[PDB]
Design a protein around this nucleic acid. Structure first.
Lengths: 153, 269, 37, 83, 53, 69, 60, 21, 84, 490, 127
RNA sequence: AGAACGCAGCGAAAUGCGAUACGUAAUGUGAAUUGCAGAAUUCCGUGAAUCAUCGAAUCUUUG
RNA sequence: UGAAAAGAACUUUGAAAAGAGAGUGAAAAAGUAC
RNA sequence: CCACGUCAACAGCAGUUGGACGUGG
RNA sequence: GCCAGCACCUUUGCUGGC
């Protein structure tokens, strides 16, 4: 049904993995998706492992809303780092599936490049936050359904 | 020794003789505005329709007790709560409920018939079946020439038999005009089937005779054919849809019966 | 408040709580189910 | 004749089968209209007993549980093997 | 210990105490877990696996 | 003779039928509950409702005889 | 012989009378499992006996 | 815990002992 | 063994705030990580008692700790961090 | 030791005896088959003698005892003269204590389930030491001595008999297929059957029973058929002569085989309703003979163990000459005025009348008593089997019944009640017709695997049933291609 | 199907009278399937209500030539399962395949002693 | 008129009936019923219907 | 959704959810508020 | 509530945890 | 019923105090 969406690959030179209806951010995983990248599966993996320890976050192109005055890095093409480890776990769980569906493939071994990745609106969880006089404002705990595909170069 | 005088034609037949004159009620100017007006008058009387119900309205108690916050009351309507309602529902301004008149009946329309108007309408209709070149225009095909509109025998009443229907239809030729009817374009009509709209088949010819009916049991059925009398006939049978110039077939004794009227109405041009 | 006494009124609403629907799913396969509950 | 059957079914559960072991106590479920006398009479003519105590209480199953203590000489092991 | 919400309550209940005072052995915590009865914690108390403060 | 419904049962008179019925209710009171088992059985369903089907017969004959008197 | 053991052997002889006397394809299966079961036999007691006779040759 | 090779060694050395003696 | 005194005159008088103690346990953890050259640091309930005995406010400043090694190596690292 | 202590356990002598402890590693599938034929190749060496030279020379041991041989899993005059006999016996003893209910155990608790297992293997080694002091009081060896090499001979058999209970365990830990109890019973038939029937003929003489004329199949068929390398001819059919007919022993391995492999093919068919559909479904048969298999092993073992009336333990008190409370009133095992000398009148009418000749029709009285006893013992251990766990009638019927109704989810009916009519009244009598068919096959003749063959070719057709079903319905090289599978539902 | 006229329902209501109204013996009408010409002559009829032991061949559809006994047919769903094909999945998950009765022609019959007596004698409309 | 709470082999949704509890009867019919998992009854004449009966025996509690 | 549930076997991967390839069918960007 | 089994949703993150979910008593 | 000691793997037995 779904994917690539940039159709050319072709599937004898491809590996594929997709998440599906997990409860991890829409807003901060489009930025991770744009920034994985690109870079092999091993380069993407070890970056996001070091992220957990001390290495930000991963550069934010467009979702760079203030925040204080920031920061140190890195800071390649950006200046507004954060540190959500929520979106790190989601993309690590995508990469492990893509690297264990790239282990029977059998292709190998240099090659790679993350050809396309796209994130879908799973939707938004709808919840509420109390405030004043029986009036109540929206609260979202953001989920996403994601798709990941690679091609030999 | 010739005036509107016609030669008889039979279903045997292979004619051999002569017939009574063509009527003077087949003369009068063909007028399409009257033909259409009479056609829509008769079907309006029958027609009615149904639509949304709940009540029409009005589940739903109100007098306009909207509660202001913003943008207004709205403007309208009140009662009330987690529904439904707003407005609503009671609209319009509807995202669920009724329209602004739920189909009303109520709504007196009709056209009441007048004695003079009715006998003008029949006279013009009978002078709209005296053409020839509007038969092709309407959408039915006649190979046969001349003798138009066609004349048939008294033996048309007697049938009954299915195979003598085929024997009649070859003579008036026609024939392939009634094989048009039973063939796709006939197809399937949708939701417009119910009230007739419809999709998309075309009509066949009309047959008329004078004494009878005749309409007997087996003159009912045969595809696209209709059967009528000179005593009782109408513009739904002489031009369905009001696009004048139906292929009409007649039978002798039509002239004499039609001619004598009293009544009081006669040709003028 | 008061009613027609009674312990019995309590008993038949205790049964009703248990008898509540809840729940299963094996018939939602074989219907025509139009989601409910 | 307007009499009813009392015992709809006997209850068997983890606690119910423990009662049988303790002192030959069967435990039943009986009608919502049930009375002490008719429980005493019913178990007499379906198991051949002398009942040594009837007491009844409500259950959220709706049908009224009935605690029925029975004779020592009855032997409730081998007639709870019957049921 | 894991899922010994029940064996804090039951162990406390049989010795009639407030659930703070009751003690569960760390070494034989698995054998406390495998009890799930009120006569299976009589055994544990008598051994000294469960003690009361 | 063999069985148990519906031409043996209907015309049977009637003390005999009552005696049989309550001893087909001791089959199902030895087998209730549980002892259900898990059941259905179509035997249990039929005999549950052949207490129903023939206590309508017993109370019908009593009703009709009182209208013949 | 009272009520209990006559009841016991009533269903104990419906046990022994559900047959299905052996067909010729069940017979083939018996033959090849006592053909395999006669050559499992056929190498074990053969091995023992052949080297048994040399015991009495070597030691008088 | 011993092993399945200790039992194996025991018997084949026992069979050896009996023929030898 | 080795024995060190972790200087808790440094930063552990400037903290408070209110929450000296849960930060303080973490500071000892990564001081002993650097000194011993190890990954995991055990953090005994002996140490936990020793830093919550006076309770937050409420430390006894510098403390003595006895520390051992390591060569296990990463598989099942041993760093005693109490009194060996 | 003693001191002043309250004990009654014999703890300190236990690790002062070199007992056994067992594996450890196991490997399938090519190393199950390799190591369970390796197990049967250590058993195979029954050609080897047993140390003892005044009894291997001139008397060369007394005549073979063909009654013990079939159920022991043994061969006389070798390292494995006892086989499974004390191992199965410690099963008899503790089937008796548990099932009589002098000692009561509920085996669904882990602690006392494995207490039973440990107690059995300890008592198998306790039963081993007393069995090898039984077998030198039998007078089997053709000599009776004071403590010298009669002490050494008993040590050897125990030291290679703790080996044969190790074989049982090693196979059972998953390093072989089946159980090593089943396997050694079904290579007793392998040793005994083709020694008897294929054999080889040799020329020597001997007043006592010797194995000189053996190899009946070759002797019979090739003299009937033509001539061989050996110069033979003529047909020998039946005789009551000293020289064996040869036909007699060929017929009576086949005769039993047909009818005891077909008693397992008589089955108790159990309907279900269904697997996917509403309507009739599987005919689901259960094994008749394999349920009663361990019941009839207990039953047949005890006919060679009782002091009051059995072979081994009355041959002792015939041999031993002080007469007191125990005496040869138990039975007289001595030479007879009869032509063939086996006990003239014992109380062992639980003895099989069969020999490796034809049956005995000369005493109908001993036949009736033998049949009666083993049917009583065949229903004795049938209800001890029911009492002691397994797929218990009470537990399994109860479990699925109340598990099904309220669960998950939920669910409803099983056939369990309607087959609790069929199963427990087919279980007891299923070890009463198994003890009937072993004796009626023995009646025809056959000895030295008389009842070993019967449970070994129907233990070989039990094996066949399991493997064929696995191949053709679970997967492998299969027969599901012809017509399968489960249709119905929508 | 139904013969004109008396009830003048245009209408999806008329369709629902086939779907939901009139079980088994007016699904006699809707499970009837036409006879051959050998067995039209034999019993003098034209069509016969289906038996579960009748053997019937498929004439219309995409599975338009297969014979076989009828495994099941349902009164509610008016649809005939033919034995079989089916169409298996490899673990034995196995499937119905259902058809419409008036897209079939019945070849061999299994008709009974007084099954044909009621059908042949007049018909009706005696329910 | 209407309503409560029950009933079941199961009980999502609908209405079928009343401690006898989707029961069944009297006409009447013909190979499939019990929604299905599942448990079984029937099939060259007594299983099975509201196809048609303002038609029936039983009928709690409230009104 | 489809004529018919044929409502996706089996295999590999994944803590599971799920994914990869594959099966069914006329059509699966007809794969279940379809 | 109580006991046992679970984490899809629900708990303001998270979860090996629950008053949640599900089934007994 | 509660507490303590000794025997006992436990289930229990014995003795003393309240």
């Amino acid at each position: 049904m779904a994917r690539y969406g940039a159709t050319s690959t072709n599937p004898a030179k491809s590996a594929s993995a997709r998440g599906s209806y997990l409860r991890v951010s829409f807003k901060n995983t489009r930025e991770t998706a744009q920034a994985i990248n690109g870079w092999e599966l091993t380069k993407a993996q070890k970056y996001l492992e070091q992220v957990l320890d001390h290495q930000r976050a991963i550069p934010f192109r467009r979702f760079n809303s203030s925040i204080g005055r920031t920061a140190q890095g890195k800071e390649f093409g950006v200046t507004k780092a954060r540190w959500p480890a929520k979106s790190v776990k989601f993309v690590q769980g995508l990469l492990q599936n893509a690297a264990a569906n790239a282990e029977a493939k059998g292709l190998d071994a240099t090659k790679l490049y993350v050809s396309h990745i796209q994130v879908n609106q799973a939707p938004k969880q709808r919840r509420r936050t109390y405030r004043a006089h029986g009036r109540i404002n929206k609260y979202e705990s953001s989920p996403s359904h994601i798709e990941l595909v690679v091609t030999e170069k | 020794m010739s005036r509107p005088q016609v030669t008889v034609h039979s279903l045997t037949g292979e004619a051999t003789a002569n017939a009574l004159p063509l009527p003077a009620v087949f003369s009068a100017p063909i007028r399409p505005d009257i033909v259409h007006t009479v056609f829509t008058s008769v079907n309006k009387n029958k027609r009615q329709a149904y639509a949304v119900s709940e009540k029409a309205g009005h589940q739903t108690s109100a007098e306009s007790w909207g509660t202001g916050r913003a943008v207004a009351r709205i403007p309208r309507v009140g009662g009330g709560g987690t529904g439904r309602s707003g407005q609503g529902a009671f609209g319009n301004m509807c995202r669920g409920g009724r329209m602004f008149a739920p189909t009303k009946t109520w709504r007196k329309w009709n056209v009441k018939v007048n004695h003079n108007e009715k006998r003008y309408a029949t006279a013009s209709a009978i002078a709209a079946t005296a053409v020839a070149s509007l038969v092709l225009a309407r959408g039915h095909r006649v190979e046969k020439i001349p003798e138009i509109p066609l004349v048939v025998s008294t033996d048309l009443e007697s049938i009954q038999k299915t195979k003598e229907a085929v024997a009649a239809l070859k003579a008036v030729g026609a024939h392939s005009d009634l094989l048009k009817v039973l063939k796709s374009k006939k197809l399937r009509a949708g939701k417009g089937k119910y009230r007739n709209r419809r999709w998309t088949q075309r009509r066949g010819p009309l047959v008329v005779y004078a004494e009878d009916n005749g309409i007997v049991k087996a003159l009912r059925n045969v595809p696209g054919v209709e059967t009528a009398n000179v005593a009782s006939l109408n513009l739904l049978q002489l031009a369905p849809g009001a696009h004048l110039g139906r292929f009409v077939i007649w039978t002798e004794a039509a002239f004499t019966k039609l001619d004598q009227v009293w009544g009081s109405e006669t040709v003028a041009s | 408040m008061a009613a027609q006494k009674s312990f019995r009124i309590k008993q038949k609403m205790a049964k009703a709580k248990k008898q509540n629907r809840p729940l299963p799913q094996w018939i939602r396969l074989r219907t025509n189910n139009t989601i409910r509950y | 004749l307007d009499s009813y059957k009392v015992i709809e079914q006997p209850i068997t559960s983890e606690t119910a089968m423990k009662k049988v072991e303790d002192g030959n106590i069967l435990v039943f479920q009986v009608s919502m209209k049930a009375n002490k006398y008719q429980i005493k009479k019913a178990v007499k003519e379906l198991y051949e007993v002398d009942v040594l105590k009837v007491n009844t209480l409500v259950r959220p199953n709706g049908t009224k549980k009935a605690y029925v203590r029975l004779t020592a000489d009855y032997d409730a092991l081998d007639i709870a093997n019957r049921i | 210990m894991a899922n010994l919400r029940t064996q804090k309550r039951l162990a406390a209940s049989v010795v009639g105490v407030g659930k703070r005072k009751v003690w569960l052995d760390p070494n034989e915590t698995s054998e406390i877990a495998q009890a799930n009865s009120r006569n299976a914690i009589r055994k544990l108390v008598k051994n000294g696996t469960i003690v009361k403060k | 003779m063999a069985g148990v419904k519906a031409y043996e049962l209907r015309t049977k008179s009637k003390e005999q039928l009552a005696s049989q019925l309550v001893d087909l209710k001791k089959e199902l009171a030895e087998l209730k509950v549980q002892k259900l088992s898990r059941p259905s059985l179509p035997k249990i369903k039929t005999v549950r409702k052949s207490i129903a089907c023939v206590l309508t017969v017993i109370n019908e004959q009593q009703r009709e005889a009182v209208r013949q008197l | 012989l009272v009520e209990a053991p006559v009841e016991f052997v009533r269903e104990g002889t419906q046990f022994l009378a559900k047959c299905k006397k052996p067909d010729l394809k069940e017979y083939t299966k018996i033959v090849k499992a006592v053909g395999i079961g006669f050559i499992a036999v056929g190498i074990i007691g053969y091995a023992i006996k052949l080297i048994h006779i040399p015991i009495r040759y070597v030691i008088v | 815990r011993v092993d399945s090779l200790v039992v194996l060694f025991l018997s084949v050395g026992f069979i050896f002992s009996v023929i030898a003696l | 063994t080795r024995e060190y005194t972790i200087n808790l005159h440094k930063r552990l008088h400037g903290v408070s705030f209110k929450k000296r103690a849960p930060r303080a346990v973490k500071e000892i953890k990564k001081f002993a990580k650097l000194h011993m050259g190890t990954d995991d640091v055990r953090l005994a309930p002996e140490l936990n008692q020793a830093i919550w005995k006076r309770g937050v406010k409420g430390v006894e400043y510098r403390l003595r700790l006895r520390i051992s090694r390591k060569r296990n190596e990463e598989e099942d690292a041993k760093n005693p961090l109490f009194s060996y | 030791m003693s001191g002043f202590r309250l004990i009654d356990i014999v703890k300190p002598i236990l690790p002062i005896l070199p007992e056994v402890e067992l594996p450890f590693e196991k490997l399938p599938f090519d190393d199950k088959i390799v190591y369970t034929i390796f197990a049967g190749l250590i058993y195979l060496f029954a050609q080897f003698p047993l140390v003892g030279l005044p009894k291997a020379t001139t008397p060369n041991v007394n005549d073979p005892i063909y009654f013990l041989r079939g159920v022991f899993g043994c061969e006389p005059r070798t390292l494995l003269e006892f086989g499974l006999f004390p191992n199965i016996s410690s099963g008899l003893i503790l089937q008796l204590l548990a099932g009589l209910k002098v000692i009561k155990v509920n085996f669904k608790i882990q602690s006392d389930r494995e207490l039973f297992q440990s107690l059995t293997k300890v008592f198998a080694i306790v039963q081993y030491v007393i069995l090898t002091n039984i077998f030198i009081f039998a007078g089997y060896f053709g000599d009776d001595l004071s403590v010298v090499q009669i002490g050494l001979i008993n040590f050897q058999l125990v030291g290679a008999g703790i080996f044969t209970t190790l074989l049982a365990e090693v196979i059972d830990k998953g390093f072989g297929f089946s159980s090593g109890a089943m396997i050694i019973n079904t290579v007793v038939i392998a040793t005994n059957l083709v020694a008897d029937t294929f054999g080889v003929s040799q020329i020597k003489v001997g007043e006592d029973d010797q194995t000189e004329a053996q190899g009946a199949l070759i002797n019979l068929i090739q003299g009937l058929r033509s001539k061989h390398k050996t110069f033979i001819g003529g047909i020998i059919s039946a005789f009551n002569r000293d020289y064996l007919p040869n036909l007699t022993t060929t017929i009576i391995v086949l005769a039993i085989a047909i009818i005891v492999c077909y008693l397992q093919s008589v089955r108790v068919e159990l309907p279900i309703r269904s697997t996917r559909a509403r309507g009739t479904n599987n005919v689901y048969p259960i094994k008749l003979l394999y349920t009663g298999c361990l019941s009839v092993l207990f039953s047949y073992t005890i006919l060679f163990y009782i002091h009051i009336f059995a072979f081994v333990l009355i041959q002792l008190v015939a041999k031993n000459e002080p007469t007191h409370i125990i005496c040869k009133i138990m039975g007289h095992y001595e030479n007879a005025n009869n032509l063939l000398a086996v006990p003239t009148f014992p109380l062992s009418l639980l003895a099989p009348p069969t020999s490796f000749f034809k049956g005995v029709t000369q005493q109908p009285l001993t036949f009736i008593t033998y049949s009666a006893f083993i049917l009583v013992t065949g229903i004795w251990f049938a209800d001890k089997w029911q009492a002691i766990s397994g797929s218990s009638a009470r537990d399994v019927a109860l479990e699925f019944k109340d598990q099904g109704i309220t669960l998950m989810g939920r669910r409803e009916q099983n056939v369990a009640k309607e087959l609790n009519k069929v199963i427990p009244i087919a279980a007891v009598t299923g070890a009463s017709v198994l003890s009937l068919i072993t004796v009626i096959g023995e009646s025809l003749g056959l000895k030295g695997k008389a009842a070993g063959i019967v449970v070994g070719i129907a233990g070989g057709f039990s094996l066949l049933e399991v493997i064929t079903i696995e191949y053709q319905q679970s997967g492998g090289q299969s027969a599901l291609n012809q017509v399968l599978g489960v249709p119905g539902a929508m | 199907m139904a013969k004109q006229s008396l009830d003048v329902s245009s209408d999806r209501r008329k369709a629902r009278k086939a779907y939901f109204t009139a079980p088994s013996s007016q699904r006699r009408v809707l499970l009837s399937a036409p006879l051959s010409k050998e067995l039209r002559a034999q019993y003098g009829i034209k069509a016969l209500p289906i038996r579960r032991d009748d053997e019937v061949l498929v004439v219309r559809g995409s599975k338009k030539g297969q014979e076989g006994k009828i495994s099941s047919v349902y009164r509610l769903k008016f649809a005939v399962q033919v034995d079989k094909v089916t169409k298996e999945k490899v673990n034995g998950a196995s499937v119905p395949i259902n058809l419409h009765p008036s897209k079939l022609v019945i070849t061999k019959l299994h008709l009974d002693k007084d099954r044909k007596a009621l059908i042949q004698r007049k018909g009706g409309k005696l329910e």
